[PDB]
Amino acid sequence: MIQVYSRHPGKSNFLNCYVSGFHPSDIEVDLLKNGERIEKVEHSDLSFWSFYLLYYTEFTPTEKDEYACRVNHVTLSQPKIVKWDR
Amino acid sequence: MIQVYSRHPAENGKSNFLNCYVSGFHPSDIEVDLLKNGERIEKVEHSDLSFSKDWSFYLLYYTEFTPTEKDEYACRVNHVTLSQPKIVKWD
């Protein structure tokens, strides 16, 4: 259900966080470099009745630089509505 | 803190952009829908105009639209709560 791996096998690459089973704004996904959030994370469309998606970011690996993925359930609450006043 | 406005003054049948400006929040703590006749517009864009210097945070959510005489538009800003974290390292 969550798996982390590199797109291609010390130069620029992509780091993938594969999520299978999870309903995506139903979810929040962070990619971490040494425990801290990577700024730009992309994600594929849902692909299917199982599904997966991939959250990925471009990265250059270094031997002591470590990477992870954090997945959280998202709950939406307390809407505030503002009408467009023409 | 939440404002809804068009890029240019609205002229009926003329292409424009609809903006929900949201200030005072980090983007990952809210979820923002733009609405047409009370229903969710599918393709919303967002910019983050923030620095982390403060007030603090300024976010724009927007979409090209053609206003019409009677089509009604709005913005909903939801609170986001995170739970059941899972963390997976890269081996």
Curated annotation (Swiss-Prot), chain B:
Cellular compartments per GO CC: cytosol; early endosome lumen; early endosome membrane; endoplasmic reticulum; endoplasmic reticulum lumen; ER to Golgi transport vesicle membrane; external side of plasma membrane; extracellular exosome
Which residues, renumbered to this chain, are glycosylated? Answer: K14, K36, K43, K53, K86, K89
Medical condition linked: Immunodeficiency 43: A disorder characterized by marked reduction in serum concentrations of immunoglobulins and albumin, and hypoproteinemia due to hypercatabolism. Patients may suffer from recurrent respiratory tract infections and severe skin disease.
Give the chief site where it resides: secreted
Please explain the role this protein plays, according to its UniProt record. Answer: Component of the class I major histocompatibility complex (MHC). Involved in the presentation of peptide antigens to the immune system. Exogenously applied M.tuberculosis EsxA or EsxA-EsxB (or EsxA expressed in host) binds B2M and decreases its export to the cell surface (total protein levels do not change), probably leading to defects in class I antigen presentation.
Q: Could you confirm whether the keyword Secreted appears in this record?
A: yes
Phenotype for W55V: Increases tendency towards amyloid formation
Tell me which UniProt keywords the record has, alphabetically: Amyloid, Amyloidosis, Disease variant, Disulfide bond, Glycation, Glycoprotein, Immunity, Immunoglobulin domain, MHC I, Pyrrolidone carboxylic acid, Secreted, Signal
- The protein's name in its UniProt record: Beta-2-microglobulin
Domain of life assignment: Eukaryota
Q: How does it assemble?
A: Heterodimer of an alpha chain and a beta chain. Beta-2-microglobulin is the beta-chain of major histocompatibility complex class I molecules. Polymers of beta 2-microglobulin can be found in tissues from patients on long-term hemodialysis. B2M alone (not in complex with HLA-I) interacts with M.tuberculosis EsxA (ESAT-6) and an EsxA-EsxB (CFP-10) complex; the tripartite complex can be detected in the host endoplasmic reticulum. The B2M-EsxA complex can be detected in patients with pleural tuberculosis and is stable from pH 4.0 to 8.0 and in the presence of 2M NaCl.
Q: Which cysteines are joined by disulfide bonds?
A: C20-C75
Q: Name one GO biological process term.
A: antigen processing and presentation of exogenous protein antigen via MHC class Ib, TAP-dependent
Could you tell me where this protein is found in the cell?
Secreted; Cell surface
Domain (Ig-like C1-type) spans 2-88
Q: Which GO terms describe its molecular function?
A: identical protein binding; MHC class II protein complex binding; peptide antigen binding; protein homodimerization activity; structural molecule activity
Q: Which family does it belong to?
A: Belongs to the beta-2-microglobulin family.
